From Swiss-Prot, chain A:
Residues 1-230 form the NR LBD domain. Orphan nuclear receptor. Binds the NGFI-B response element (NBRE) 5'-AAAGGTCA-3'. Binds 9-cis-retinoic acid outside of its ligand-binding (NR LBD) domain. Participates in energy homeostasis by sequestrating the kinase STK11 in the nucleus, thereby attenuating cytoplasmic AMPK activation. Regulates the inflammatory response in macrophages by regulating metabolic adaptations during inflammation, including repressing the transcription of genes involved in the citric acid cycle (TCA). Inhibits NF-kappa-B signaling by binding to low-affinity NF-kappa-B binding sites, such as at the IL2 promoter. In the cytosol, upon its detection of both bacterial lipopolysaccharide (LPS) and NBRE-containing mitochondrial DNA released by GSDMD pores during pyroptosis, it promotes non-canonical NLRP3 inflammasome activation by stimulating association of NLRP3 and NEK7. It comes from Homo sapiens. It is found in: Nucleus; Cytoplasm, Cytosol; Mitochondrion. This is Nuclear receptor subfamily 4immunitygroup A member 1.
């Protein structure tokens, strides 16, 4: 499809090539003081989140039809889907067999270098990365799934039906692609992994809550807004 | 002191007698994350501690002669940390058994489900508190010190600090009559344990199997610096 193509091109452009990975701050072994953190750790955590949102916005806008939605709908879909998108894209990108996390800037950091600011969450993201990698999801299938995480029913949408339409389009796209490779829903093996992902979004929220308590440095406003908006109370 | 006496009397009156401990629901054994009944029990147990602590606080000399707002503030800010400290002092971590202020006795596994990790950390603190072997008068002073302390928003911060000083003198003289800061060193880690409490409630509030009781929920929100 020209849709699939658009989706894949959008995806690849939203992340680094093996060519341009950034190992400058990579350290194969760091010795941290666990269960505890300084302001630099927390800043880096927030910076990394912030960087993903900016990248994800730009990625979202290259999804056909996404850019035509109500501006409020655009923001809503992006806020509701951000953590889950951050985790999924990071898990798909990273190499858990080397304990290394790869961010969308190309930045490469090791489990131990993130342990301070992310806490346990980073270990659990890595566990998910393993389990994701074991179902072997090709880039076009991923380019569809990521879009599907974003483009989905959320409470408060102004034009729920346009969103559902755009959902339907992307789901067909995925279906045809899956048939092109191997005539099917299948998929259920992958959805079996989706509880792990929900849980990981919760951990994310819990971590931010905790850092917000501690307040060594305050969250960036956009991240803080998402934190608050996505709380069902 | 008549102060110390007042503090000790207040403390002892605020919990169960070995006589009236309630082992009815105690179970040594069980198995095997949590359901609504676990969460309800957690909130019930917190709720049960509330009114006991207000009544205890009012028997502290001078406490009752603070601004009503200051009274409520000091109580809301100190509730979790008081619940934890009194529970840790009261419980027997060697036997894995938690004793609540109703006299209810439960085993660490019987409330692991609803407290999560926090219960282990409370029990860890209980061990550590006990190793210091803190006698009842010293405890009666410490608990008061957790309550009567600087909080953001106090109307009469200095009266509170004066009352602090009084109680700290009381404690110091008592320890000498019989560490001087080994027990005071405990309070920092109690704050940390409060944090876990908050984190747990946040988590339960996310999953929402049952909502918090209003009074507990109010404390949760009011004690958030944002
Ligand atoms: C690998 C673990 C699962 C990750 C991929 C699943 C994507 C999320 C998903 O299917 C999904 C589920 C919905 O109910 C929905 O309305 C949507 O737009 C997408």
């Amino acid at each position: 499809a020209n849709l699939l193509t658009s989706l894949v091109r959008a995806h690849l452009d939203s992340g680094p090539s093996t060519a341009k990975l950034d190992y400058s701050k990579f350290q194969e072994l760091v010795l941290p003081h666990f269960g505890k953190e300084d302001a630099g750790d927390v800043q880096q955590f927030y910076d990394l989140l912030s960087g993903s949102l900016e990248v994800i916005r730009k990625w979202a806008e290259k999804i056909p039809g996404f850019a035509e939605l109500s501006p409020a709908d655009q923001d809503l879909l992006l806020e509701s889907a951000f953590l889950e998108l951050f985790i999924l894209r990071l898990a798909y990108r990273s190499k858990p067999g080397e304990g290394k996390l790869i961010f969308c800037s190309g930045l490469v950091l090791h489990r131990l270098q993130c342990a301070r600011g992310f806490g346990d969450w980073i270990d659990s993201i890595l566990a998910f990365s393993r389990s994701l990698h074991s179902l072997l999801v090709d880039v076009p299938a991923f380019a569809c799934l990521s879009a599907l995480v974003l483009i989905t029913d959320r409470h408060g949408l102004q034009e729920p039906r346009r969103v559902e339409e755009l959902q339907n389009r992307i789901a067909s796209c995925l279906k045809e692609h899956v048939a092109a490779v191997a005539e099917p829903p299948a998929l259920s093996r992958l959805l079996g992994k989706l509880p792990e992902l929900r849980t990981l979004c919760t951990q994310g929220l819990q971590r931010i809550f905790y850092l917000k308590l501690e307040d060594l440095v305050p969250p960036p406003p956009i991240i803080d807004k998402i934190f608050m908006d996505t709380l069902p109370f």
